[PDB]
Structure formats: structure tokens, C-alpha cells
UniProtKB/Swiss-Prot annotation:
Fe cation binds at H187, H266. It catalyses: 2-oxoglutarate + O2 + 2 H(+) = ethene + 3 CO2 + H2O; L-arginine + 2-oxoglutarate + O2 = guanidine + L-glutamate 5-semialdehyde + succinate + CO2. SUPFAM superfamilies: Clavaminate synthase-like. It comes from Pseudomonas savastanoi pv. phaseolicola. The gene is efe. InterPro entries: DIOX_N, IPNS-like_FE2OG_OXY, IPNS-like_sf, Iron_ascorbate_oxido_reductase, Oxoglu/Fe-dep_dioxygenase_dom. PANTHER family: 2-OXOGLUTARATE (2OG) AND FE(II)-DEPENDENT OXYGENASE SUPERFAMILY PROTEIN-RELATED. This is 2-oxoglutarate-dependent ethylene/succinate-forming enzyme. The keyword Chaperone does not apply. Keywords: Dioxygenase, Ethylene biosynthesis, Iron, Metal-binding, Oxidoreductase, Plasmid.
């Protein structure tokens, strides 16, 4: 039912790249999502990542809970700690942020959220790193095609995503265990571009754009999208399909395009067996600021590092990472890093 596209290995800006970019935009504007074909290596790396996740989630909770850091938000989040629209969600999550050693200048300087991933083991680490490298190559192709489809300079988005704050939620949803099956409530993702992968079980639903339907700007405090539309059609079931990933826009793409793209609402229904999935977020650099592309006189911005840091401090207010940000006033580094820049 969803449209499927094959991305070229390199995007150069030829007229055929532009036509493809236009078709991607159209598919987002019609369906809110599309599929991209994966080759055998991309597929193999996806399956290996799922298998490492399955093996890790079988480890005792005492061990899983130890995969945490007071420097980065990377690591384990137990089920029931995350909340959407006020109702706790069901998946357990391992978040992979940029994996920076304590010798990296940003970690040495104590920038908020910067630090080494607390990996469960080296085998899990290698599976996730090599999967995320392929996801990143796809994200860059997608962002060049999107710029081209809007008749923007080819590097409009990728200039912001150099050394971008790419990160991935590695998710396991439990089987249904009662009448309740809302695994994650309706929400939109806070980032730029989302690439999603899943096993064969099934449970992700997305909402296409709806003519005449008002959508909130979820990056603004007084316009949360959480919970909206949850019990009203249309919700498109994202059918597990071999040999594809799916792609949809996040809040920052809605912001930059002034709503010409909408951040795709999505939710997860628990299945009668456990379900593994990965949600990859291809993001601006921690120091980059998103801006409105088509309203040049608009002064509003989204400073990405501030956006991410505030989000994660609110989501995990008791995590050791948040406590150390507060104890050491790490937010002050964000203020400092903008001091002498051209706004
Ligand atoms: C709430 C609800 O209906 C569910 O979790 O299935
Ligand atoms: O891909 C999925 O299963 C949903 C994950 C999701 O919506 C999220 O992590 O924000
Ligand atoms: Mn999401
Ligand atoms: Mn969150």
C-alpha cells in the first residue's frame, strides 16, 4: 500500500534526482510516509541489530539497568518510564547517541549530553554502529533529495547535519498482557528526519495528512501533538515488509518547511507477541539552528542542542545524566557556545 523508492547511491542534483525528490515530497504529503528499498547488506545489518536487541533484552534487569551514563542519555530505559500524553508507555528502550570518548574535546569540556555509550558488550556495539552508519548514508541521500525537490540548494539540510546528532531508539514492545494494547500513544517525533525499521511482527500506525485538519506545532510549549487524533481515523498500519525501511518527517522538518511537510503522527499497538523495532533520527549538529526556509523575515529558530537537552531532561528528570547536568550547570555551556556567532 505504501509507496516504495530506490535511492541512488549518490545524489548529484541532476534533473532525475530533482524529480525523485519531488516524488518523495508528494508521497509524504499524501501518505505521511514511504518505503525505501534496502540492499542485502543494509538488510543484513538491520536484522543483526534486531537480534542483538533481542539477546540484550533477555539479560537480567539488574544488568540492563546498569547500562547508563551520567554524561550521555545513551543507554537503557526500562518500560513504564516514558510517558506520552500523561499515560506511561510500554516498550523498553536502548538509546544510542553519538559515541564520544572522554578524550573528545566536547566531553572534556562537559557539554551536556556528550559522552560514551554505556554499551552492554562489544558485539551489540558493533551491530548498532554498522547499522547506524548505513542509516546515516540514507539520511544524507534523503536530505539532499528533499532539498532538491523543494528547488533549494542541494546542501540546504546537509549543511546542518554535518557531524549531526544522529541517534536511535532500539525498542522492544512486550506482548499484550491485558485488555490494554496502547504500546505508545499518538505523538510526533521531535527531530528532523525519521528512518524506521521493524521485525515481522507488526504494530506501528501512522497518520497521513488530512485535508482541513489542524495540526499543532509540537516544538512550541503550548501546542503539544501528544495524544491528538489517537481514536479517529485515518491510521495507516505500517505493514512489516522485507527489504525496506520507512521514512517520515519530524517536527524540525515541519518547522523548516513551514508546514509544507507535517511531522507524521504515529503510535504503536502491542501485538500478541513481543515486537522489535528501531527508530533512527537523522539530526542537525548539536550546535546548529533550524530556521524557516520559506519565510525569510521570520526570526524564530530551533537551536538543536538546546532542543534535545531540554527534551531529554524533561523525559528523564531523575536519570543520573539529568542530575549531573543540574549539579554542574552544564546548560551554561549551551549559552556560552552561541556567544560570538552570527544569528
Ligand atoms: C487505553 C487503551 O484502550 C489501551 O491501552 O488499549
Ligand atoms: O518505530 C516504532 O516502533 C515507534 C517508536 C517511536 O514512535 C518513538 O521512539 O518515538
Ligand atoms: Mn516516535
Ligand atoms: Mn522522550
Amino acid at each position: 500500500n505504501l509507496q516504495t523508492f530506490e535511492l541512488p547511491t549518490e545524489v548529484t542534483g541532476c534533473a532525475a534526482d530533482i524529480s525523485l525528490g519531488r516524488a518523495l515530497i508528494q508521497a509524504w504529503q499524501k501518505d505521511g510516509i514511504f518505503q525505501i528499498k534496502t540492499d542485502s547488506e543494509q538488510d543484513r545489518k538491520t536484522q543483526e541489530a534486531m537480534a542483538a536487541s533481542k539477546q540484550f533484552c533477555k539479560e537480567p534487569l539488574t544488568f540492563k539497568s546498569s547500562c547508563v551514563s551520567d554524561l550521555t542519555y545513551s543507554g537503557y530505559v526500562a518500560s513504564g518510564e516514558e510517558v506520552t500524553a500523561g499515560k506511561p508507555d510500554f516498550p523498553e528502550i536502548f538509546t544510542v547517541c553519538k559515541d564520544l570518548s572522554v578524550g573528545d574535546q566536547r566531553v572534556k569540556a562537559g557539554w551536556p549530553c556528550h559522552g560514551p555509550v554505556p554499551w552492554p558488550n562489544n558485539t551489540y556495539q558493533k551491530s548498532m554502529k554498522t547499522f547506524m552508519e548505513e542509516l546515516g548514508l540514507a539520511g544524507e541521500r534523503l536530505l539532499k533529495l528533499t532539498a532538491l525537490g523543494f528547488e533549494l540548494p542541494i546542501n540546504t539540510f546537509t549543511d546542518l547535519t554535518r557531524d549531526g546528532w544522529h541517534h536511535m531508539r532500539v525498542l522492544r514492545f512486550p506482548p499484550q498482557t491485558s485488555t490494554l494494547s496502547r504500546g505508545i500513544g499518538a505523538h510526533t517525533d521531535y527531530g528532523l528526519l525519521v528512518i524506521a525499521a521493524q521485525d515481522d511482527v507488526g504494530g506501528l500506525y501512522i497518520r497521513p495528512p488530512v485535508e482541513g485538519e489542524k495540526r499543532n506545532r509540537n516544538w512550541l510549549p503550548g501546542e503539544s501533538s501528544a495524544g491528538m487524533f489517537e481514536h479517529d481515523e485515518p491510521w495507516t498500519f505500517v505493514t512489516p515488509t522485507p527489504g525496506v525501511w520507512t521514512v517520515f518527517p519530524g517536527d524540525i522538518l515541519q518547522f523548516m518547511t513551514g508546514g509544507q511537510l507535517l511531522s507524521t503522527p504515529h503510535k504503536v499497538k502491542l501485538n500478541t507477541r513481543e515486537r522489535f523495532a528501531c527508530a533512527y533520527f537523522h539530526e542537525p549538529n548539536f550546535e546548529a539552528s533550524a530556521y524557516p526556509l520559506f519565510e525569510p523575515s521570520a526570526n524564530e529558530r530551533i537551536h538543536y542542542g538546546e532542543h534535545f537537552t531540554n527534551m531529554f531532561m524533561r523525559c528523564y528528570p531523575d536519570r543520573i545524566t539529568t542530575q549531573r547536568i543540574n549539579k554542574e550547570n552544564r546548560l551554561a555551556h549551551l549559552e556560552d557556545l552561541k556567544k560570538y556567532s552570527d544569528t
